[PDB]
Amino acid sequence: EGRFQLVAPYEPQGDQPQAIAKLVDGLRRGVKHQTLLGATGTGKTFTISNVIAQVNKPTLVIAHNKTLAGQLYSELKEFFPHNAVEYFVSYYDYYQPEAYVPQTDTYIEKDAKINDEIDKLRHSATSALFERRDVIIVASVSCIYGLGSPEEYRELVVSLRVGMEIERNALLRRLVDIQYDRNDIFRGTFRVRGDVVEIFPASRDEHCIRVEFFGDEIEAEVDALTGKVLGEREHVAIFPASHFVTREEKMRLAIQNIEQELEERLAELRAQGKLLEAQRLEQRTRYDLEMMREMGFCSGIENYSRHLALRPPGSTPYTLLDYFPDDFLIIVDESHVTLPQLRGMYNGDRARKQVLVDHGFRLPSALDNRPLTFEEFEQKINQIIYVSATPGPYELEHSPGVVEQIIRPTGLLDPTIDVRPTKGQIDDLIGEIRERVERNERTLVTTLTKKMAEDLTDYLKEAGIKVAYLHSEIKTLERIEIIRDLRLGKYDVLVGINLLREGLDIPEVSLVAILDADKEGFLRSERSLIQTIGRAARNANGHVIMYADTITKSMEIAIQETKRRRAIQEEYNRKHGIVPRTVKKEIRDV
Ligand SMILES: [Zn+2]
Ligand SMILES: [Zn+2]
The missing domain is CATH 3.30.2060.10 (Penicillin-binding protein 1b domain)
Structure with a gap:
């Protein structure tokens, strides 16, 4: 079994073809790392699938949170209905990661609930890698975690x-x-x-x-x-x-080995410290040991994984990457975010367990049951393609230039950008908002501080505008419930601190004000600004106003990059006779 068959109603258009073909040729010529610099609005997933279909390689796709991974799942199910499409997430994105707070002397237990549905797909995912070569698994950062x-x-x-x-x-x-x-x-x-x-x-x-x-x-x-x-x-x-x-025979030896260390670490712990002496782990270790020789499993077996595997201490874990065939393909979605997250997993995990070995609630060996380091992730990579509109430094340095894909099918362009002074910024922005209102279009406004927003919100109301909020964490259910409200005429403007918050892509939004454009912050970085500038690219009159006193380096790059993309898209609309028009969308409900 080994045939990928992509099923789409439409076809590779705009500039997918060059992107597909280029990525495909880089695969075959054996390039280790490539980057797909693609603008939102283009057919990013479809382009990636086409690559996949053309190379016939079992591939893992890495999203960086439960939702995106889910989204690619359904989408990729559709593109490939006659193939092996899998979901490999985990319970890492919820339940207490069992740790201990010393100062507050308050212990937390691994408290989780196996969401059985997941387990199904984990297992169908882990099985399919042994049945067919036509497999695609969507997964979170979890794929770099200690597996069997x-x-x-x-x-x-x-x-x-x-x-x-x-x-x-x-x-x-x-x-x-x-x-x-x-x-x-x-x-x-x-x-x-x-x-x-x-x-x-x-x-x-x-x-x-x-x-x-x-x-x-x-x-x-x-x-x-x-x-x-x-x-x-x-x-x-x-x-x-x-x-x-684990096979009984290996388990019988592992049990001994645990013991030789639940013991010999007590000797090293006895001499050094006096943390309950050393001891205190005896209650759950010996409890776990007995529960293992009397029954194959035990509480948090994971913690014994290196022992059960019968490998040397410090050994690099086994992970989903190791279940894949020797020449698979990895695709990192939103790679400028996914990669940094991936790499910080080990430090955080080691920190939270180093402590657990300190209040002797786990043994040293438990440190060997962790996620991969970035270097180990690298060593396990056969061939990767990173996908992002704003690729991070790792992708650009490791890949040979970039494969671009900036043409959207409706010919919508990246907006124009105006940078204006901070003196008069509020009345200036009100004027520009009133006009959007008359033209029946909505604005999105971003400030740095959660109190400069509160300030502005109330100010706008005082101008007679249907303003949105100020509160960052307004749930998730009342959020989707305000967006909808905004793309219906309930409100005209919407003030937030973080506009990169998934679900803000809105065709009715034609203006985007950025209020402390030149201020230091994550959300005013080069990549963050470009990503925010993109919230005005869903509309044919899309415009961006940056209020600032100076043109930072972040602002320069972002402005130069948007411009470069806009010219390119504009020439494409010219050579092909397209007139930019806003993609309509259905106003549903909850
Ligand atoms: Zn053409
Ligand atoms: Zn390197």
Whole structure:
């Protein structure tokens, strides 16, 4: 199995073709790193898919938060309905990352809830990498996290076929060995028939937990359901219901080794400190040890992963990247944000666990169960393509120039930008807002301080304007509920501190004021300004007013870059006879 087949109603237009073709040629010529400098509004995902389709490579796509990853998932499901599209997120984006606050002497327990749906896809994702080569997995930063090993997974595989002879209680045990998927209560699970022709309905095998259930009748298996049969199979392969499954024999040795260190660190801890002496871990360690030799698992098994794997201390973890074939493709979405996040994962994780080993709530060995360092992420890269409108320094330095893709299909342009003085900035901006109102268009205003905004908001009302808010964290449900309100005429202007807040792309917005354009801050950086300038590119009369006293380096670059893109798009609309017009959108609701 190995054929990618991209299904789109439309076709590569604007400047995708050169971008696709160029990226594709860089893959084949063997370039390690490439960058897709693409403006929002162009068909960024479609372009990436086309690349994928053309090279026929199993690929991982890295989003930097639960939502974007989800968005690429559905989108990429659509582009590839007849292929292996997977979702690999985790519980890293929620639940207490078990740590300890010394000063406040207040312990936090790993308190999480396995959202079963995820687990399904994790497992279907981890399985598919062994069935077909036509696989695409969307994932968060989690993909660089400590997972089980890959071979001791492909190795713990229960291969079922017709003609082969296996007890009705042999396969039953080869099954419990792998932390049993559908071998328990709710019912006899897979118990029925028996003999040299049994029932065995291997149902909840998480890598298909959306009612699939494989039923095999002594080498004579066929897919089924919660109702009845469907699609007859000759060969089926079951995957370990867990990512961290260890063979009894290795577990017996790991248990010893844990002990040789739960002990020998007590000797080193005894001599040095007097933190409960050293001891105090005994309650959960020995508790966990007993829970391991009396049952394959235990509380937070993850913490023993290096031991269970039987590898040397300091060893580099096993991760989703290691489940992939030797020559996969990685695509980093919003790479100017995703990469920095990725690289800061280890420090943060080590910090929060160094402490846990200090109040002896975990042993040193627990430090070996962590995310990858950036250097280790690099060493595991075969070939990557970074996607971003404003690529970071790592992407630009490691890739040979950039592959551009700035032409949107409606020919909408990057806005014009005016930079004006701060003296009179408020009455000046009001004039410009009133006009937008008359023309039936909305403004978006950004300030640096959360109190200069409050100030401005109230000022605008005093001018008789339908102003938006001031509060940064106004939930997520009342947020989507104010945007909608703004793109309907409820309000005309909208004041926020951070306009990079996902969900502000609004075709009715024609003006964007930036109030302390030349002030230091993350949100006034070169990349941040360009990203903000882009909130006025969704409209044919898009304009940007920057209020400032000076032209910073950040402002220069941003202004020069927008200009360069606008000229280019304008010439393209000229050579092709396109007249810029605003993409309409449906005003839905909640
Ligand atoms: Zn053309
Ligand atoms: Zn380098």
